[PDB]
Structures are given as C-alpha cells and as structure tokens.
C-alpha cells in the first residue's frame, strides 16, 4: 500500500456557528463546510489519496474530538478550514495559514507551501503563515495546518467567500499545495 490520508476539518458546526456576517447573517460553519467539501472532492480524485473528514454535515464537534478523530485516522496531513474575523473591525482582508507552536514535524513547511500556492490561485492578500496554539493543531499527531480563508467580517471578503467559483479556485489552490507537500515530504 502507498496511499496518503488527508484529514479535512471544516471548522465549527452545529451549535457552534463560528463568525456570523453582520451584513447577511451567514455563518462561518456553513461556508467552512462548503469549502471543505470542494477540497475533499478534489483530493479524492487524486490517485494515491484517501480523504477523511471530521464532518460532512452541520454537526457539532468539540476541539478535543477533532484531534482524536484525526489521530485515530492515522492521517498524513491535517487541513482545518476556517474563516477569519476581526473582533473590532470590518476591513481586514486576505488569507493566512496557521501551524502549531514551534512545529518541527513539517507543519511549518506544509503551511508555507499551501499558503504560497493559495496566493497563486486566488491572488488574495498574502498574510503569510502564523504559529498558533489552537487545540486541533496542538493535539494532532501529524503535520497540521489551519487555513483562515478570508475575513467573513469584511463585506468585500464575504462576497468572495460565498462565491462558488472563488471557493473552487481556493480549493484547487489548497489541493495543489497539499500535493506539492506530499510529493516531497510524505
């Protein structure tokens, strides 16, 4: 056998709505699932790739449980999909990718490759890569990143995030970043 397993984690779900648009009352949880579904479908078409997702529907899953699911799936890579939010603002734009604090396992490399590839596909503002102690990253056992796919709190970004062709481009960019990582550092 020679397959890589990619665990996709659409952030939030169920009772946890994540960020909520002030314009339109759209929820991050729903947009995360839309983007993740496109990413999952694209990865599953690749030859040596098996996809595992934390959720396929509007289900609540705790942070602890997501890391447990990822770990039990023996994934090679974890990609969590979230949207960013400004607590006191509605102007920020762009995409950034997080990895666990002081990662030595290749998470930092995965983050940079995915981030740079995304920037080439959607041509959004490059906010770079960031260390973050988010529990899903911290407690997962394999290279793990969380992509903040634009600011749902910024009306311009929301108009992109909701758009299917934009979601498709973003998902394609993520796929190519993951494959480029896996091709070189499985």
* Site for Zn ion, rule CB under 5 A: 11, 18, 82
Nearer Cβ to Zn ion (82/127) = 82
Q: Shortest distance, CB of residue 157 to Zn ion, whole angstroms?
A: 14
Catalytically annotated residue among 20, 109, 139, 148: 148
CB atoms within 10 A of CB 39: 26
* Cα 159 to Cα 87: distance, rounded to the nearest angstrom: 19
Buried b (16+ CB within 10 A) or exposed e, 40-58: bebbeebeebebbbbbeee
Q: Give the C-alpha distances (Å, rounded to integers) separating 137 from 77, 98, 124, 147, 151.
A: 11, 8, 24, 11, 20
Check the annotation: does 131 bind a ligand. no
DSSP state of 105: S
Instruction: Count CA within 13 A, CB hemisphere, residue 132.
Output: 18
Active site residue 148: yes
Nearer Cβ to Zn ion (18/177) = 18
Nearer Cβ to Zn ion (82/160) = 82
Check the annotation: does 82 bind a ligand. yes
Q: Shortest distance, CB of residue 89 to Zn ion, whole angstroms?
A: 16
Cβ-in-10-Å burial (0-12, 13-18, 19+) of 1 comes to exposed
Nearer Cβ to Zn ion (11/150) = 11
Say whether 169 sits in a helix, a strand or coil.
Answer: helix
Residue of this chain nearest to Zn ion (CB atom): 82
151, 84 contact by CB (below 8 A):
yes
Q: Shortest distance, CB of residue 36 to Zn ion, whole angstroms?
A: 12
Check the annotation: does 164 bind a ligand. no
As annotated, the binding site for Zn(2+) includes: 12, 28, 82
Q: What are the residue numbers of the active site? A: 148
């Amino acid at each position: 056998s020679n397959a890589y397993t990619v665990f996709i984690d659409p952030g939030h779900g169920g009772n946890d709505k994540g960020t909520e648009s002030k314009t339109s009352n759209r929820y991050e949880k729903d947009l995360n699932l839309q983007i993740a579904k496109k990413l999952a479908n694209k990865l599953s078409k690749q030859k040596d790739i098996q996809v595992v997702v934390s959720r396929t529907d509007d289900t609540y899953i705790s942070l602890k449980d997501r890391a447990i699911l990822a770990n039990n799936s023996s994934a090679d890579v974890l990609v969590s999909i979230h949207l960013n939010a400004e607590k006191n603002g509605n102007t920020a734009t762009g995409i950034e990718t997080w990895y666990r604090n002081k990662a030595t396992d290749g998470s930092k490399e995965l983050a940079q490759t995915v981030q740079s590839t995304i920037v080439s596909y959607v041509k959004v503002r490059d906010r770079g890569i960031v260390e973050n102690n988010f529990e899903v990253l911290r407690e997962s056992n394999m290279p793990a990143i969380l992509i903040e796919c634009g600011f749902l709190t910024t009306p311009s970004e929301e108009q992109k995030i909701i758009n299917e062709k934009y979601q498709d481009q973003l998902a394609e960019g993520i796929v190519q970043g993951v494959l480029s990582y896996l091709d070189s550092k499985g």
